[PDB]
């Protein structure tokens, strides 16, 4: 049994005890996913604040901060934005497969 | 209220052309922060096979050893990825390269004088005076004879001029070719130029019928503006053809009569290839890497 | 068999102890060291 | 660390008196019942759960006793000394949740033993940490058991009378 | 020195087009303009790398310390 505990690190110094406002810290990520994830998280009707931020160009880090209104924590809203980004990549893959099979 | 079923009902793909090296295709009604990520991955994250470690035995030619080892690394190999596996970084050298990670190439070229009639061209006058990229001889090491027999390792452009010699001089080397991503070094980049452009939008405002419509033809590429008469005056045939040169916005007859914007969710991707993979297939790798970039973040714990 | 090269007449030439450091065909003094078969390694970067 | 050393010295020592076992636990539950008024509405104030690390360390030592020395607190009738079958009923559903904030493994086996002794029923609240879940030097002191079994091959022969095995 | 393998800016493979380009200017007597477009160099970041190459290796190769004269 071996998970990976460096890839995502919730920063408790800026995380509300309510859970509805947290600041995550990914390693080895940048504008690639952090702008794709910020887009899909902001489509949740319960999200009040979302933004990604790279602290310095040197280290490969990524901070995204979700604040919700209520009845959904930011950890609960981080993972809805990861499934809908997983579901969106399957739509694009299912359309780009048809059109290659349409030539 | 945004939903992923709303995205599926209004997302189209219109493939313009699809060559063996370049593919051109449009994505419609997707966000700029998602279509940027596909360009982003095709350059960086999509892996490829490049020579990484170069072992010289004798290089007596004019080109330096660290330069010639760099030129071999920029040679694109026609190796399919998802045959090699990823080499490990923190295991020592005697255990690091296997018959499953590494492809071994080699090169043994000596130049000799040729007795020829006479100024004179060096392909007539010296034997092995030009080293090409096809002289990288694939050496199937380990069990790479029952699995690379259909597909032998050949450079994707076999006429890349690697070095030049004169008689007496020789090059004798052995390069290990390993898998890697383009974000580390640019030689692992599977695509020459993966890029998009945004669809131009030409909004004529007043009717610009007449001889003025003939000089509104000329302010665009020829397959953009069409004319019939004062009726069917000036309509946009194909805005995809237009490069945004803004030649119409420097005339005083048309500073008021047109507006030049973009269609903000209509992308026009142009994906070439380094030869190792077809460009429609390094796009599927790009869209699955982003999905696999997100499953690994979903199915992952959070401590402290 | 280690050798050298005469810089003038380009004749390959090994050299022993108690020898004048000269080429043996022309009488040239400057006599550059050839390279032999020996492994060096590089990153392809 | 001394609370960490206390629960492992009581429960991993063979030749003791049974009335020595209870007076540690009687004083320890007294300290938690002298905790019962003063510091049990401080939780809802602006602070953290790290303000109570002395309380969680003492309750963790209480769980480590009962996972080893449990049949002592069964009396002749079949009941429990000093309301231990009523004490953990209050401690678990308190506003500290000491099931989460103590060590995982000493609380994992305490949940199994509370079923096999019929003292607590705290499975569903350890279950109730799915989306619900400085600290590193506090997690690590919960992992240092002082009376881990000896590796020394020839000193344990003397210690076999003194030091209790797993079962 | 020798022709670069790739374009510096975009990254298209350029180093196989130097010996072809010198035939398109000697044999076919084309200009530099049509000789680049026939080779497929269509972005001006990679047109400027065949167009502009010096090919100093043929000047370095004349100094061979391994042969007579």
UniProtKB/Swiss-Prot annotation, chain A:
Subcellular localization: Nucleus, Nucleolus
Subunit structure as annotated in this protein's UniProt entry: Component of the RNA polymerase I (Pol I) and RNA polymerase III (Pol III) complexes. Component of the RNA polymerase I (Pol I) complex consisting of 14 subunits: RPA135, RPA190, RPC40, RPA14, RPB5, RPO26, RPA43, RPB8, RPA12, RPB10, RPC19, RPC10, RPA49 and RPA34. The complex is composed of a horseshoe-shaped core containing ten subunits (RPA135, RPA190, RPB5, RPO26, RPB8, RPB10, RPC10, RPA12, RPC19 and RPC40) where RPA135 and RPA190 form the DNA-binding cleft.
Record keywords, A-Z: DNA-directed RNA polymerase, Isopeptide bond, Nucleus, Phosphoprotein, Ribosome biogenesis, Transcription, Ubl conjugation
Highest taxon listed in the record's lineage: Eukaryota
Entry function: DNA-dependent RNA polymerases catalyze the transcription of DNA into RNA using the four ribonucleoside triphosphates as substrates. Common core component of RNA polymerases I and III which synthesize ribosomal RNA precursors and small RNAs, such as 5S rRNA and tRNAs, respectively.
GO molecular function annotation: DNA binding; DNA-directed RNA polymerase activity; protein dimerization activity
Signal peptide coordinates: none
Shown residues within the full chain: 40 to 142 of 142
Predominant location: nucleus
Glycyl lysine isopeptide (Lys-Gly) (interchain with G-Cter in ubiquitin) cross-link, renumbered residues: 95
Coiled coil: none
Annotated source species: Saccharomyces cerevisiae (strain ATCC 204508 / S288c) (Baker's yeast)
Other notes: Present with 8680 molecules/cell in log phase SD medium.
Protein name according to UniProt: DNA-directed RNA polymerases I and III subunit RPAC2
From Swiss-Prot, chain B:
PROSITE patterns given in the database record: RNA_POL_D_30KD
Record-level GO BP terms: nucleolar large rRNA transcription by RNA polymerase I; ribosome biogenesis; termination of RNA polymerase I transcription; termination of RNA polymerase III transcription; transcription by RNA polymerase I; transcription by RNA polymerase III; transcription elongation by RNA polymerase I; transcription initiation at RNA polymerase I promoter
Molecular functions per Gene Ontology: DNA binding; DNA-directed RNA polymerase activity; protein dimerization activity
Keywords: Acetylation, DNA-directed RNA polymerase, Nucleus, Phosphoprotein, Ribosome biogenesis, Transcription
One Pfam family of this chain: RNA_pol_L
Family: Belongs to the archaeal Rpo3/eukaryotic RPB3 RNA polymerase subunit family.
Protein name: DNA-directed RNA polymerases I and III subunit RPAC1
Organism name: Saccharomyces cerevisiae (strain ATCC 204508 / S288c)
Lineage, top ranks: Eukaryota, Fungi, Dikarya, Ascomycota, Saccharomycotina
From Swiss-Prot, chain D:
Coiled coil: none
Compartments where found: Nucleus
Entry function: Required for efficient transcription initiation by RNA polymerase I. Interacts with Pol I in the absence of template DNA and stimulates recruitment of Pol I, but does not remain as part of stable preinitiation complex.
Family as reported in the entry's similarity comment: Belongs to the RRN3 family.
Note, other: Present with 138 molecules/cell in log phase SD medium.
The protein's assembly and partners: Monomer. Interacts with NOP53.
Name by which UniProt lists this protein: RNA polymerase I-specific transcription initiation factor RRN3
The species this protein was found in: Saccharomyces cerevisiae (strain ATCC 204508 / S288c) (Baker's yeast)
Source taxonomy: Eukaryota, Fungi, Dikarya, Ascomycota, Saccharomycotina
Residues of the full protein shown: 419 to 614 of 627
From Swiss-Prot, chain E:
A cellular component annotation (GO) from this entry: nucleus
Molecular-function annotations in GO: DNA binding; DNA-directed RNA polymerase activity; zinc ion binding
Keywords (A to Z) from UniProt: DNA-directed RNA polymerase, Isopeptide bond, Metal-binding, Nucleus, Ribosome biogenesis, Transcription, Ubl conjugation, Zinc
The protein's assembly and partners: Component of the RNA polymerase I (Pol I), RNA polymerase II (Pol II) and RNA polymerase III (Pol III) complexes. Component of the RNA polymerase I (Pol I) complex consisting of 14 subunits: RPA135, RPA190, RPC40, RPA14, RPB5, RPO26, RPA43, RPB8, RPA12, RPB10, RPC19, RPC10, RPA49 and RPA34. The complex is composed of a horseshoe-shaped core containing ten subunits (RPA135, RPA190, RPB5, RPO26, RPB8, RPB10, RPC10, RPA12, RPC19 and RPC40) where RPA135 and RPA190 form the DNA-binding cleft.
Similarity comment text for this entry: Belongs to the archaeal Rpo10/eukaryotic RPB10 RNA polymerase subunit family.
PANTHER family (alphabetical): DNA-DIRECTED RNA POLYMERASES I, II, AND III SUBUNIT RPABC5, DNA-DIRECTED RNA POLYMERASES I, II, AND III SUBUNIT RPABC5 FAMILY MEMBER
Protein name per Swiss-Prot or TrEMBL: DNA-directed RNA polymerases I, II, and III subunit RPABC5
Organism of provenance: Saccharomyces cerevisiae (strain ATCC 204508 / S288c) (Baker's yeast)
């Amino acid at each position: 049994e071996e998970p990976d505990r460096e890839k995502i690190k919730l920063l408790t110094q800026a995380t509300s005890e309510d859970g509805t406002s947290a600041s995550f810290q990914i390693v080895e990520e940048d504008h690639t996913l952090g702008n794709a994830l910020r887009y899909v998280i902001m489509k949740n009707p319960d999200v009040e604040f979302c933004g990604y931020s790279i602290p310095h160009p040197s280290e490969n880090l990524l901070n995204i901060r979700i604040q919700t209104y209520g009845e959904t924590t930011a950890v609960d809203a981080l993972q809805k934005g990861l499934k809908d980004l997983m579901d969106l990549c399957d739509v694009v893959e299912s359309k780009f497969t048809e059109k290659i099979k349409s030539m | 209220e945004w939903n992923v079923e709303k995205f599926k009902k209004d997302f189209e793909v219109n493939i313009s052309s699809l060559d063996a090296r370049e593919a051109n295709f449009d994505l419609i009604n997707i966000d700029t922060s998602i279509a940027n990520a596909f360009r982003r991955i095709m350059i960086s994250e999509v892996p490829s096979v490049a020579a990484e470690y170069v072992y010289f035995f004798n290089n007596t030619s004019v080109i330096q050893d660290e330069v010639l080892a760099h030129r071999i690394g920029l040679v694109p190999l026609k190796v399919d990825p998802d045959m090699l596996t990823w080499v490990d970084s923190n295991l020592p050298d005697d255990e690091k390269f296997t018959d499953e990670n590494t492809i071994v190439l080699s090169l043994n070229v000596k130049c000799t004088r040729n007795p020829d009639a006479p100024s004179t061209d060096p392909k007539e006058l010296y034997n092995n005076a030009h080293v090409y990229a096809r002289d990288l001889k694939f050496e199937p090491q380990g069990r790479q004879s029952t699995t690379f027999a259909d597909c032998p390792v050949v450079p994707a452009d076999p006429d890349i001029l690697l070095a030049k010699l004169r008689p007496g001089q020789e090059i004798s080397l052995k390069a290990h070719c390993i898998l890697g991503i383009g974000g580390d070094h640019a030689k692992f980049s599977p695509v020459s130029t993966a890029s998009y452009r945004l669809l131009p939008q030409i909004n004529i405002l007043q009717p610009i019928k007449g001889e003025s419509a003939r000089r509104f033809q000329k302010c665009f590429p020829p397959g953009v503006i069409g004319i019939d008469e004062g009726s069917d005056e000036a309509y946009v045939k194909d805005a995809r053809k237009d490069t945004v040169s803004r030649e119409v916005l420097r005339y005083e007859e048309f500073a008021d009569k047109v507006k030049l914007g973009r269609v903000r969710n209509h992308f026009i991707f142009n994906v070439e290839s380094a030869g190792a993979m077809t460009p429609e297939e390094i796009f599927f790798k790009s869209v699955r890497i982003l999905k696999n970039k997100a499953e690994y973040l979903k199915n992952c714990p959070i401590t402290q | 068999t280690l050798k050298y090269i005469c810089a003038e007449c380009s004749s390959k030439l090994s050299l022993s102890r108690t020898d004048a450091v000269r080429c043996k065909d022309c009488g040239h003094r400057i006599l550059l060291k050839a390279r032999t078969k020996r492994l060096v390694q590089f990153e392809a970067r | 660390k001394s609370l960490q050393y206390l629960g492992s010295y009581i429960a991993r020592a063979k030749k003791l008196s049974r009335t020595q076992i209870i007076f540690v636990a009687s004083y320890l539950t007294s300290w938690l019942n002298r905790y019962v008024i003063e510091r049990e509405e401080e939780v809802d104030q602006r602070g953290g759960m790290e303000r109570f690390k002395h309380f969680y360390a003492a309750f963790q030592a209480l769980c480590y006793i009962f996972c080893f020395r449990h049949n002592i607190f069964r009396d002749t009738d079949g009941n429990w000394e000093c309301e231990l079958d009523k004490f953990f009923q209050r401690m678990v559903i308190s506003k500290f949740n000491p099931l989460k904030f103590c060590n995982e493994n000493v609380m994992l086996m305490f949940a199994r033993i509370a079923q096999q002794e019929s003292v607590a029923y705290c499975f569903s609240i350890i279950e109730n940490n799915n989306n619900e879940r400085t600290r590193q030097q506090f997690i690590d002191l919960q992992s240092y058991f002082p009376y881990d079994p000896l590796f020394l091959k020839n000193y344990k022969i003397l210690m076999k009378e003194y030091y209790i095995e797993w079962s | 020195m020798i022709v670069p393998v790739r374009c510096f800016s975009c990254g298209k493979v350029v180093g196989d087009k130097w010996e072809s380009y010198l035939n398109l200017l000697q044999e076919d007597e084309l200009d530099e303009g049509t000789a680049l477009s026939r080779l497929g160099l269509k972005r001006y970041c990679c047109r400027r790398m065949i167009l502009t190459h010096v090919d100093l290796i043929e000047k370095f190769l004349r100094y061979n310390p391994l042969e007579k004269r």
